[PDB]
Amino acid sequence: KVFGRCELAAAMKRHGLDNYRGYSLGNWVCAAKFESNFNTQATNRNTDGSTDYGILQINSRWWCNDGRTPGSRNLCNIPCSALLSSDITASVNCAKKIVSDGNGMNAWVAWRNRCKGTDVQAWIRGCRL
Ligand SMILES: [Pt+2]
Ligand SMILES: [Pt+2]
Ligand SMILES: [Pt+2]
């Protein structure tokens, strides 16, 4: 599913991401834009052999099992395919564990390099939140 901007804002809001660990909804929407372009089906294979999955490009080294990432943990106790669903619940539950691990949203290098310190409120403009 390729989400609309406001559509993904609403879904992220219902699932408890607005101000989660202090991050306003716009930060989550900006991150999703530059990680996946709002596509729940996005996958990206890393040179280390891990893969990034779904709307927030969650990585198989630590967070999910894909059956092909060597010496990997599965700290979110899900199959990585759960992260490609049109239903974002599994990705949001995983994103909460990741953002809680100590580096906040710096865990998403696209957030650090393209969203951090910018006017991220622009990403929720117009949306009925
Ligand atoms: Pt939803
Ligand atoms: Pt939820
Ligand atoms: Pt856009």
Curated annotation (Swiss-Prot):
Entry keyword Disulfide bond: yes
Ranges of residues in domain C-type lysozyme: 1-129
InterPro entries cross-referenced by the UniProt entry: Glyco_hydro_22, Glyco_hydro_22_CS, Glyco_hydro_22_lys, Lysozyme-like_dom_sf
Catalytic activity: Hydrolysis of (1->4)-beta-linkages between N-acetylmuramic acid and N-acetyl-D-glucosamine residues in a peptidoglycan and between N-acetyl-D-glucosamine residues in chitodextrins
Residue sites binding substrate per the record: D101
Intrachain disulfide bonds: C6-C127, C30-C115, C64-C80, C76-C94
EC number: 3.2.1.17
This protein's record includes keyword Hydrolase: yes
Superkingdom, taxonomy of origin: Eukaryota
Subcellular location as annotated: Secreted
Any one GO MF annotation of this record: lysozyme activity
Main subcellular localisation: secreted
Enzyme kind, highest EC tier: hydrolase
Example GO biological process: cell wall macromolecule catabolic process
Record: active site: E35, D52
Something else known: Lysozyme C is capable of both hydrolysis and transglycosylation; it also shows a slight esterase activity. It acts rapidly on both peptide-substituted and unsubstituted peptidoglycan, and slowly on chitin oligosaccharides.
Function: Lysozymes have primarily a bacteriolytic function; those in tissues and body fluids are associated with the monocyte-macrophage system and enhance the activity of immunoagents. Has bacteriolytic activity against M.luteus.
Alphabetized PANTHER family for the sequence: LYSOZYME C (PTHR11407:SF28)
Family: Belongs to the glycosyl hydrolase 22 family.
Stated name of the protein: Lysozyme C
Organism field: Gallus gallus (Chicken)
Lineage, broadest ranks: Eukaryota, Metazoa, Chordata, Craniata, Vertebrata
Gene: LYZ
